[PDB]
Design a protein around this ligand. Sequence first.
Ligand SMILES: Cc1cc2nc3c(=O)[nH]c(=O)nc-3n(C[C@H](O)[C@H](O)[C@H](O)COP(=O)(O)O)c2cc1C
Length: 350
Amino acid sequence: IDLFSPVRLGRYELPNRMVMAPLTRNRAGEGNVPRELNAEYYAQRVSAGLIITEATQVSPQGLGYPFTPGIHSQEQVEGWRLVTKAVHDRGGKIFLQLWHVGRISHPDLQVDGALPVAPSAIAPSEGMAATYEGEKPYVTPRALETAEIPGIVEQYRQGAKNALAAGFDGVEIHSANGYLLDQFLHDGSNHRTDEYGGSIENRARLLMEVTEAVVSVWGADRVGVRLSPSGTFGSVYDSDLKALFTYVVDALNQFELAYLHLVEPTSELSSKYFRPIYKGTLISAGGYDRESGNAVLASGDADLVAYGRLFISNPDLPQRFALNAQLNPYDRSSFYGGDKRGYTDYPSLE
Ligand SMILES: Cc1cc2nc3c(=O)[nH]c(=O)nc-3n(C[C@H](O)[C@H](O)[C@H](O)COP(=O)(O)O)c2cc1C
């Protein structure tokens, strides 16, 4: 098995084991609606065995950065249909990454200056909010009421139904990188004393409920979950990160989702640790190249290998890797925001 070998992923037969990782690009149109430029971009990358979209908010409440697309409105459904059609016209597979930023936002990004919501009224210790005006200090978020938790689950349920209507092949639940679900999981960011805080089971409960709701919409073989055991991004810490992720990964084996997507870490909490704990398909991401991607597949510790930055600058990464060709350099300055430049103008091979 290598990067070029076919693989089964839930209800699909993919032609290779290379995944385009989810990548926020901040290039949405009016009302956070995807646009023709975004469809071009994903279409250029269809040689990935599977594309995961940029994180996509399930509500205005759940947005935390400028110009990110949503999946809550009919207009957004119709914008994403541009993307699904473009990808499917070229025979590719695409899953939409369902997002809620939780506390990683700012009143200036919120309608009417509402506080961001979170498991607890605890600001991130580190970093700054990314507002339309520039960076600003985070404010303390508002703790969700217990009777608000159903509403959160419904945002994910409706966003999953909207993705389905838009023509995606599936969805990925973003439970990584210090966003709302991950803020629930960590006991440094979750100090609740209802059934969504306290024990590890309780801190994992919102993720389990969201996953159950999303599976009911799509079928489990069209649903993935992404987590970050060694992920501290978003000022998210926990006393026993291992045990916490050891039960969360063991609780996802009862949902039988298409895959579990892990951000790799040095911390023990790699795919080598989780392989005997998870019982499905594993996608591994973070810092891979061609050599290291083949290696992790050779080791048996992961089934697919996701690539982020190299997919930004190499739309035909799989062919470049096959032919041992040189890659285009990536320009970090145009990762987040802007126009076609550093987005759709990186060339495939001649
Ligand atoms: C510009 C950029 C945007 C990203 N946005 C997302 C996102 O929307 N959702 C997510 O789960 N991770 C996001 N990530 C993390 C990547 O999915 C991925 O794990 C990382 O890029 C893989 O490492 P690599 O770039 O070394 O391949 C982002 C990373 C970068 C550099």
